[model samples]
Target: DKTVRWCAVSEHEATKCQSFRDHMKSVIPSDGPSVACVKKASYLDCIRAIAANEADAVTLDARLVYDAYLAPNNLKPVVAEFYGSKEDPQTFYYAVAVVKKDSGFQMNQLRGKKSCHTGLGRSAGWNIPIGLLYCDLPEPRKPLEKAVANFFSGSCAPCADGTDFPQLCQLCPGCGCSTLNQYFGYSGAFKCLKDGAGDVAFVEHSTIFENLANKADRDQYELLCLDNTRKPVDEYKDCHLAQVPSHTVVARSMGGKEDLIWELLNQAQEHFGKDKSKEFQLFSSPHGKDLLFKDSAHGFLKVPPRMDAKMYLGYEYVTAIRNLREGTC
Candidate 1:
């Protein structure tokens, strides 16, 4: 008696989702049919809506999609990939990072630097970028550990002692930046770099390249790569410069429509290759099948787990400020 509602990020992405839905509707049998669509403010919101059971399914960045799936609540991934970036051919996703293209300082030169992020719950905006950068730092440096310590200690200044306190300080600062230091920035990464507010600022991959090209006239920034143990490094490009995956479509296992959903997703994936849609990309991975059904119907979907928040924030912002109170160059 009710229409199936689908959610997506932004009007631009929503349009693409609608197009895909329409195409699928036309091709799939109408017996189990009748559908509707809705636009969400952000990708995270889309996941929340589906988790809340307000919608049948939604699309989100692979990282965020994974994180949402990992939440204690039950959420399942029905689709594994949607798009790929033209810039990085091997991968089909985005990542957050601290940019220093105009700072005249190399990536390694940023030892003990200050950073920010768009927010805490952000995957590309905070987690993946910081995780990648910290994980990539050269051994003995332990940049990720130090950065997390600084964030939890509240010693990172600009984000310290804000009204928003711990949650923002430990994860995403009141300024909408994560205090993770190495891969964090606020008010748009470019602004932080331009204002000299931080030594390193987090930015999206596409934005980073675009900004670097416009400001430096060449590929000037270095990627913090990871070693065998996932430690960060200055010159280990081959090890750490890996790409994150793209967004995917997820549904509850109890829904009993995986085959139907996968068929629709495969159609969407195939459609992405046709170049008719500008909203999503097609990504290939060995874990595709497993990603869809590895867990129970109500199991949560998420990226690999990391340290707990308390490890980074003693009392959240208080600890973060205490750690970074000394400030950075």
Candidate 2:
């Protein structure tokens, strides 16, 4: 295939992808594989498309990377999203539980409390926290979401809609899955706590600072340590729930055209990455946050060879995700 098909999951992302296609046409050599943009309703569908050879690549969260790694899909990550300078890019971030300092709550005392989450299957927001807390197979063997619903009095775990558990979406303003929900992503989940809608917010350790620019306001919240202690927000290194790998771009394990995909991305970053061009920003979307790649990412790093999703996500993080899949699996 002389064309690299990039799968996009949302309207804004699709638009961004189209822009990338147009930009690549003007810059890439005539012999280079031209970019083709493919639109998918969701990342899951993108994985299926890649497996079916309808699409060539899609960027996925670490949690979803594990999903893509399984069964018939069998996708593998070829490139990683990196933050900080490209010379010293960061490959991981921390998952944390944020609570109001005045709330006087600990990780051990979470039962029946109101909680906010980034999304249903997200690493920082849902999988890590829920796996660390629940996933022990409560009496009668219920689904993990059901156990989470029973544990929290109410929550805003976006993408957890449906009649299976209305309580999970009770605190959500929009009360629907996807970015449309008012309390959807890391910033939105933190907003759920900031707005007093939830007692605790499960989010990335960096989320607090991203939402609260003021030092005084940022200090009002603390991290719920796994050891049942509360620590300053800056102490996430010691208090975080888990360290999650960065989002990765995946292609089918066999005949996925990963070489072409990396060449396209490597060249794309050089032309448009992080202030390289104002015409089209590779790591940004003014219409939305993290459109194709994370806005916070500075560049892309080619994942080391033989680093499948399982090895890339690491042992402890993989175990945390698998623990939740026990009953469901």
Candidate 3:
């Protein structure tokens, strides 16, 4: 019997993804009651493996979900993670503009904003926020790259082609830093604000909580509401720009253990979901915060059994994604 392999990037993520197979060996009936794990050193490799029919499942944000759902791989969403509670669960998280508690900056009115990207093509940092600023281009049909150069004075796209696009790399504090140290990632984007390197940092709503979860200074930051008003970060659900789809479980569109994978995750949710969530603490890890899932995730929600990314992420977001997603893959 072939083992239903899961993809993991980095040693820490592999530890968590691999544990499912280890802890739930007794409950799952596959692999002669076994689960398989494959380790990749990077996130792109994991997605590539799944698309190439080598790996089976991995959790991804809407940006990566778009990547997985497109191209030759054409993978589909298997299950979606629910953050908060099983009863008061969430299928999505808000993307917000984060700034210092005392900063005078306002939404749609940045008052030397160094745009921090969760990555080049992420929904929050790269897409939703870019779409917010991508208007009234100098040329009516200006290239997205050309428009962005003048839109925001300085921005840093992860793995940017600095040779071709210099302004895009100007505001990066850790510009030449290695991938591991590119502090513009989810937590790093928040780190961008906290470090005082950026007047505004674009990130998921939960980044504030994860960045300063236990610190008293957590109150020192605020969110830029869409109405040009600012609100405390925790109040994001009501005052957000857009709530793009959930961080999802992506798998091979065909020829994979869709049902058996659900069995493992559903049981994992039972033992580790919010409320009584612990023992094998499904969404929490000591280090490598936001390793497999967003560090803020409360539990997992199985997608309506079988749903594609187009349906899972819905229409508005997919359009926002396409409008900004020219070539940051």
Candidate 4:
């Protein structure tokens, strides 16, 4: 037998993949082809590789997998549940967008102004903001040109050497924004905003807010509303939205290892939870069903009625960079 190959999205989470591989090695001896896992950059690249038959499996945020399924309908999901069950599954959530407390950039205000995101194909980091906020906006209210202008203008910074200054300047020339000024990671964005980088920063609401509240200057920021599709901003009060699920694991549809792979993942969960294990536990239910093949667990990633790939392809292609604009900072 050949060695089983697995790929995860980030080097930051490689240990977890290795832990899964180690558990698989112990359970299935006979050199039955040892399990191998590697770190991959983005869910898009991983899925593209898997669809092209370049890899056996790839693990990424569930929402990303859902988006990939939308783009490449031929790909199949091998395992729907992460680490096996819904109860003790593996998962994480981050607020996908934010604006400075004083910027007065309400959801509606975002219409003409420049906005930033980690880029498309990213689930919580980018897509959530588009799907949950941008997509829901009324026509003429959407920021299509602004988004593109921002990308061309280089509004957001890329994650090069862990800094994004070059990209920031390109986007907001003479705007005096620093790559370190705004950010996209779970907590990094919040910190950057508090330090006075820009008017908006997409961050994990609950986590960022909690951490911000702990800081001495906590009173500087305000929470924005996600469900507010109405007027006056203040008229729309109950503005809280749940974090979208992260990372989904998938395999080729024609592959016969679905059950074996799922079982191995189940075991991987137990191994991850054991004392001293380095693997992270994933949450299953929130976004699990969205990756499944059928509506059995949850409907597959279906394109909305009015929108299709062609409509979004142009936009997606242009903004898919790892850098921000030059003049921002």
Best by lDDT: 2
lDDT of 2 by residue, 1-329 (tens): 28889998767778888999989889888888678888876677899999999999998778989889998999999999887576788888889999999897788889879999988888888888877776342554467777788788898987775478888888884456445566877777888999999999998877887667798998899999989999999999999998888989999888989888899999999898889998999876766666788766788889888679888888978777656667443
TM for candidate 3 is 0.84
Between prediction 1 and prediction 3, the one with superior lDDT is: 3
Which candidate model has the greater TM-score, 1 or 3?
3
Query: TM-scores of all models?
Result: 0.51, 0.88, 0.84, 0.56
Total backbone collisions for each predicted model: 48, 0, 0, 36
Candidate achieving higher TM-score, 2 or 4: 2
Question: Per-residue CA lDDT of candidate 1, range 139-225, in tens?
Answer: 433333344444422323222334534423432344322222322332345445445555544544444443343544324444433
lDDT scores for all predictions?
A: 0.42, 0.83, 0.71, 0.43
| lDDT score, candidate 4, position 96 | 40
Which residue pairs collide, candidate 2? none
Q: Which whole-number lDDT from 0 to 100 does residue 46 have in model 2?
A: 93
Q: How many angstroms is residue 63 displaced in model 2 relative to the true structure, after the best TM-score fit?
A: 1.7
User: Best-fitting candidate, measured by TM-score?
Assistant: 2
Where model 3 places Cα greater than 4 Å from the true spot, the runs are 19-21, 26-34, 136-150, 166-179, 182-184, 275-279, 322-329
For model 3, what is the C-alpha lDDT against the true structure?
Answer: 0.71
177-296: candidate 4 lDDT, tens digit per residue: 122222434344454455554455554434343344354454455556765442221221244333444344566656635555555555554554323243333321122111111111
Give lDDT tens digits, candidate 3, residues 94-203.
Answer: 88888888777677676245666676667787677767766533443245655565556677665455676677676664333223544646777777678776667888
Off by over 4 Å in 1: 1-4, 10-12, 15-35, 41-44, 61-66, 70-72, 82-98, 106-119, 122-124, 128-163, 166-246, 272-329
